[PDB]
């Protein structure tokens, strides 16, 4: 199957540079009708911004032209975003989308993961772990607290335990930072018969916590 | 620029329901025939899925049903039986020019059975009290509607402005959400009291359920 794997997302001060890169496997860069860039600022819709078609023409949405160029690599199989003059609004998930031979071309049927760029003078701070200790059911959880940019990934026992697993979406804390909590409920018997572990991992900051949790 | 305007905005149906959201775009998106709209469902964390191409084309392996009708200026995708996996925002898209241009999105949910929220309280951890701060956590787990109010309580004193909630996206195993609640507090403030108690009003709730503990 066609794979698209995103990468070269992160924090980058105003006025900056990124530089987005899509690794295509499982099909050939060249036979694309079109590979196109589109984003979605945080809980906005998504906004198409560049392309380029399999003959390398260009094409760039008016709302960024000027400091946007995509380009390709057919050797490596990757096509590539680079922005500059970075500006807050420009803070997105970016994915990149392939387009179709067929009916009108300018639809999309194979999309990357996406990879979040943040504009900020704000630093990289990692976040501290704390346990949310357990009081038929009962409640244990993780509490991920302080920390920038976006993204942290929590799992349980190395994901081993997943149902029952609530990881809430991030709140923006006044001081700038983020907190997220990850809770679980299991059987009260099993408290003593069992170890509960939160795995956090918050890449940008090269912060990685294992947190036994209990009573 | 083609505008595209989808209604509704969100929309909440009971489970294997039908239904049906429009799109308007502002010029005609018709070509030789065809006309060029398309539909995307974005499930929480995810990228967008391509559900229909060309107004009514369904997507390879996309269930059948999804559908899409409509030409010019007036199009309609319609979900036939709703279920519960189909929590997600759905976006028109025009392909007719460029900039290929989206519609705002409609938020779609299961409309289940009231359900009452779990509720469970959280003291901060003594690791977290050696750092200056405490956070007090309340837990509303699986509950629907999405709809509550959570009220902190400090030595029965109503608190205000010093928590924040987060909310679960649906989770299609049960058609439910949960909730936290922090609140913070300095932790000199925290060692000044000793009863904190979240109160938890809900539809699913005859009377406003408290969870407490005492500091010690």
Known sequence: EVQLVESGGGLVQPGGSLRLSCAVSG???????????????????????????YDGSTNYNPSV????????????????????????????????????????????????????????????????????????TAALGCLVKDYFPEPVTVSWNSGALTSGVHTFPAVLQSSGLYSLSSVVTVPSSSLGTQTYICNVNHKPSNTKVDKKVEP | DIQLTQSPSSLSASVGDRVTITCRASQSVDYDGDSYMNWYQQKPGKAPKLLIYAASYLESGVPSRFSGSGSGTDFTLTISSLQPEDFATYYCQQSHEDPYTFGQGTKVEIKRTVAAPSVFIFPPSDEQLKSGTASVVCLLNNFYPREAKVQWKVDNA????????????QDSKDSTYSLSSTLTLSKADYEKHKVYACEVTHQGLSSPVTKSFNRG
């Not at chain 1, 860039?37 to 998504?46: D, F, H, T």
């Not at chain 1, 003059?85 to 049927?109: N, P, Q």
């Not at chain 2, 109503?158 to 909630?165: F, I, L, R």
């Open chain 2, 158 to 169: 109503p608190q205000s402005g010093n928590s924040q909630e987060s909310v679960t996206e």
């Open chain 1, 65 to 136: 032209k000027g400091r946007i160029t995509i380009s390709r690599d057919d050797s490596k199989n990757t096509f590539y975003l680079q922005m500059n003059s970075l500006r807050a609004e420009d803070t997105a998930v970016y994915y990149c989308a392939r387009g179709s031979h067929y009916f009108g071309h300018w639809h999309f049927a194979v999309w990357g993961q996406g990879t979040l760029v943040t504009v900020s003078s704000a630093s990289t701070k990692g976040p501290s772990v704390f346990p949310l200790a357990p009081s038929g």
């Open chain 1, 27 to 53: 099909y050939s860069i060249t036979s694309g009708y079109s590979w196109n860039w589109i984003r979605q600022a945080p809980g906005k819709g998504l906004e198409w911004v560049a392309s380029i078609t």
